[PDB]
Amino acid sequence: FQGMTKKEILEKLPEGWKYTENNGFVHVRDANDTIRMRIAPPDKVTKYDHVHLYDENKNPLDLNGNIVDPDAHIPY
Amino acid sequence: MTKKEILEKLPEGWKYTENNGFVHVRDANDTIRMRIAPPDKVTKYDHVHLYDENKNPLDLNGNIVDAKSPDAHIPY
Amino acid sequence: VQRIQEKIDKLYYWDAWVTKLVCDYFGDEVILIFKDGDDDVTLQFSGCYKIDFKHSIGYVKEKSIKTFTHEQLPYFLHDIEIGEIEKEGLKLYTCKIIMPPMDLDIWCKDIKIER
Amino acid sequence: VQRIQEKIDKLYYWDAWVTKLVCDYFGDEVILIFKDGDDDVTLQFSGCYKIDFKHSIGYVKEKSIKTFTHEQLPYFLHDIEIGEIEKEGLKLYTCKIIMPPMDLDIWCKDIKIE
Ligand SMILES: [Mg+2]
Numbered sequence: 001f002q003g004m005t006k007k008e009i010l011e012k013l014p015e016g017w018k019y020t021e022n023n024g025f026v027h028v029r030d031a032n033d034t035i036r037m038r039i040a041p042p043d044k045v046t047k048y049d050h051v052h053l054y055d056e057n058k059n060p061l062d063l064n065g066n067i068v069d070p071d072a073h074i075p076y
Numbered sequence: 077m078t079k080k081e082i083l084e085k086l087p088e089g090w091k092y093t094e095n096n097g098f099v100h101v102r103d104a105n106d107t108i109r110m111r112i113a114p115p116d117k118v119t120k121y122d123h124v125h126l127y128d129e130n131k132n133p134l135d136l137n138g139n140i141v142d143a144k145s146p147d148a149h150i151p152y
Numbered sequence: 153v154q155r156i157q158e159k160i161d162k163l164y165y166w167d168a169w170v171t172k173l174v175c176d177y178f179g180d181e182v183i184l185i186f187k188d189g190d191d192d193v194t195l196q197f198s199g200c201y202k203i204d205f206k207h208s209i210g211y212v213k214e215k216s217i218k219t220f221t222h223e224q225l226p227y228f229l230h231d232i233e234i235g236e237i238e239k240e241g242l243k244l245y246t247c248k249i250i251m252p253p254m255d256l257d258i259w260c261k262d263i264k265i266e267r
Numbered sequence: 268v269q270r271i272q273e274k275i276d277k278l279y280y281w282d283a284w285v286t287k288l289v290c291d292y293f294g295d296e297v298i299l300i301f302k303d304g305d306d307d308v309t310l311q312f313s314g315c316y317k318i319d320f321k322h323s324i325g326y327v328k329e330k331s332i333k334t335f336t337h338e339q340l341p342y343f344l345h346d347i348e349i350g351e352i353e354k355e356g357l358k359l360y361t362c363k364i365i366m367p368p369m370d371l372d373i374w375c376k377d378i379k380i381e
Contacts, residue, residue: 022325025367095210098252107223175290179320180332205294205318217295
């Protein structure tokens with residue numbers, strides 16, 4: 001499920017996951033209110049609107065769900 | 077006395093500072109010893125406060141009084 | 153608003169020395185402790201969405217507050233004023249505190265007195 | 268002004284999780300701790316004369332932050348911006364922090380990383 005727009009990411013959210021959007025930042029958290037996903041506008045070092053992905057323990061993931069520290073900054 | 081005559085008879089190496097109609101006076105140990113204050117909800121007049129080296133409210137005669145007491149609020 | 157405001161007024165807080173002023177937990181919580189005689193009244197503001205602490209520039213701090221003695225602390229209560237606001241449909245208490253030489257403004261979801 | 272400002276940029280703070288934000292000592296002092304890998308970077312602002320924290324009302328807190336786990340904390344750093352101002356002849360550093368979902372502005376006398 002990698003190639004989505006932001007609108008379908010927010011619309012296909014899993015079961016129990018809620019989300020909130022404010023000033024162009026989206027926070028999505030799972031049923032445990034754990035932050036799992038964030039969409040952000042560009043900052044100084046990332047110059048593109050990106051997705052952030054986070055496991056059950058808030059670790060950065062890449063497209064493949066593998067834990068990462070670059071690859072953590074996922075276009076959509 | 078006026079605010080200027082109280083301030084100019086200040087003791088030893090006592091300093092002071094004024095900000096938006098509050099005057100804070102402290103002794104050589106920078107202990108707050110006196111405040112000149114505009115009226116508030118309960119005290120309807122410009123008053124003086126006096127304090128021993130332990131910040132206790134004093135009356136004109138140097139006796140400790142309850143901060144809540146009218147005697148702590150010394151007109152000029 | 154006026155229930156909250158006149159429980160506060162019946163504390164007689166005026167000219168009370170303030171012993172502790174804390175804003176903690178990502179600005180979620182404000183703690184203000186002032187002395188009533190030999191007793192301590194705590195005011196607690198929780199679920200805060202705005203905290204504005206303004207210190208007078210005229211009153212220069214010549215060392216860090218933490219190394220002050222309580223005798224050297226200038227801060228005292230002059231006026232506490234409670235109010236009400238709603239922003240994007242969330243209702244919030246507003247508190248303005250004139251604590252010379254500081255001014256405080258807090259938008260919170262609850263206010264509680266303990267002593 | 269700018270020595271500290273790009274000394275901050277050399278932390279590479281962008282998108283870092285913030286673990287603690289404390290304003291203590293009658294607003295004299297602000298502590299911000301964010302995680303660099305597994306370690307703690309401290310930002311310390313001392314000699315503060317203005318502390319202004321604004322939380323987005325769109326992000327409603329359903330419990331006191333103190334009862335959040337770090338797993339539940341949303342706050343992360345997006346931009347730290349340093350500046351300089353003078354008010355009644357007092358020169359003060361300013362720092363504006365976009366750490367969604369809140370906005371922070373500090374007028375302080377020193378900024379130091381620990
Ligand atoms: Mg990023």
